[PDB]
Amino acid sequence: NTATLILLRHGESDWNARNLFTGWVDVGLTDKGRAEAVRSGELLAEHNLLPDVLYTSLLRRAITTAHLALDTADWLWIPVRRSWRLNERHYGALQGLDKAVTKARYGEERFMAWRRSYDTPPPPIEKGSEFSQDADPRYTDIGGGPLTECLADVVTRFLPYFTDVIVPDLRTGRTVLIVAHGNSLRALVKHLDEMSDDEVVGLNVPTGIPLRYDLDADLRPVVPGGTYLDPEAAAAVISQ
Amino acid sequence: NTATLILLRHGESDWNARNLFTGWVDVGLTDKGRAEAVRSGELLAEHNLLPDVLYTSLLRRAITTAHLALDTADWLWIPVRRSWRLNERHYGALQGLDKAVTKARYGEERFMAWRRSYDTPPPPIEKGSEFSQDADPRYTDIGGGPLTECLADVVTRFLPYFTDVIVPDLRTGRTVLIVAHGNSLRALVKHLDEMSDDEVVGLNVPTGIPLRYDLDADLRPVVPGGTYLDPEAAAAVISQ
Ligand SMILES: [Cl-]
Ligand SMILES: [Cl-]
């Protein structure tokens, strides 16, 4: 390959454990999320796949995962860059709710529409409310950020980071590690495998298993959909 | 102040605990080193002194300290930049030795000369030996790096990072956190307080206590020698 691109989704958060919709709410990893981060570091070491640069979101669940993985692989010194553009989808007024409370507030029809739609965002979160990031200083330069997102939105706001920051790193032949979230990783994978809008909502991204893309001279993948560093553990997540 | 500059030396490593000369040998923190990192994070939070950018060395004992501190202060999202120029002094052929073995190999006179001299480096470490960094990939761009340093050397190789990378950040009014090592922090402090060669070898830098410099329009300090965020705990280290 001219270039290698490694994709890691973080493991379980406290709000995954409680079945709460997180979005941009900056929650921590559980112990089991941490153990997945250590494990993914072991997998990077076993395959001698040590990145020249790390990219993360601004959310502690990604950042901590990346740190734990690199610490386990004894590779903490590499450059790191972070952006909001790698954040999970903003879940709008669903941030901090669960299935039952969302269904009661908006009805079953809308809850089903938002869960599977590519184009339809949930309703905006209230400005200044407990789980809104609008006053958060990390988002000042984007006016506090969006008040809700669908996957389409995530793609629109991720693409510029990919073409302007990450693509140049990949062209230089460097091995790039991105540690981020389901929907932002979906945005990237959509672009690398030229997936359609429908194919991408249905895309499964297992947690804690780095996914290796080997890219050619045009930065198209040598193997469509990439190669998980533990293919058997990954078939396990997808099958369940 | 036009600008605030925060200085943190990392806490105890495994080789501090065993009284071994470390230099650029990339050793880990002890539990007590970790607890100092958490504590320094609490001190940054209590003083509401949250940095806009973090600078570290390439050594895991600094990097981990910085991560633990920012994690405790809930401030993990900030940009980070690292350089070898913030590394501890390279201890030459003393890397991995202790007082007794150095004295027996080189004599008491040289051991005393190297410990207190500004200008006299210890002897070079053997290339390819177990505690040499010359083959280490993080130092490829500098030819494997120096085979030994005195404090004078540290100043020569730190100054360019200060004037070219850190000074521009300080001019923009940003709060800068540097997490590094005794001798690299000594190089910086020498420059900020225009200390003489003699004054600086004798400079004490306590571990685990951030040191706040408030800089004026010329980037000269408002308070010479800075203000420790826990002045009483700091008088404790200096007095012992
Ligand atoms: Cl965490
Ligand atoms: Cl460590």
Curated annotation (Swiss-Prot), chains A, B:
Stored NCBIfam families: pgm_1 (TIGR01258), PRK14115.1 (NF010713), PRK14120.1 (NF010718)
Key words, A-Z: Gluconeogenesis, Glycolysis, Isomerase
Reaction catalysed by this enzyme: (2R)-2-phosphoglycerate = (2R)-3-phosphoglycerate
Pfam families assigned to the protein according to its UniProt record, in alphabetical order: His_Phos_1 (PF00300)
Family per record: Belongs to the phosphoglycerate mutase family. BPG-dependent PGAM subfamily.
Site positions per UniProt: Transition state stabilizer: H181
Subunit (UniProt): Homotetramer, dimer of dimers.
Top-level taxonomic group: Bacteria
Any one GO MF annotation of this record: phosphoglycerate mutase activity
Known function: Catalyzes the interconversion of 2-phosphoglycerate and 3-phosphoglycerate.
Bilayer-spanning residue ranges: none
Binding site for substrate: 9-16, 22-23, 61, 88-91, 99, 115-116, 182-183
Cited PANTHER family: PHOSPHOGLYCERATE MUTASE
Name of the protein in its database record: 2,3-bisphosphoglycerate-dependent phosphoglycerate mutase
PROSITE patterns reported for this sequence: PG_MUTASE
InterPro entries: His_Pase_superF_clade-1 (IPR013078), His_PPase_superfam (IPR029033), PG/BPGM_mutase_AS (IPR001345), Phosphogly_mut1 (IPR005952)
Main EC class the enzyme belongs to: isomerase
Active-site feature positions: H10, E88
Keyword Nucleotidyltransferase included in the entry's annotation: no
EC number: 5.4.2.11
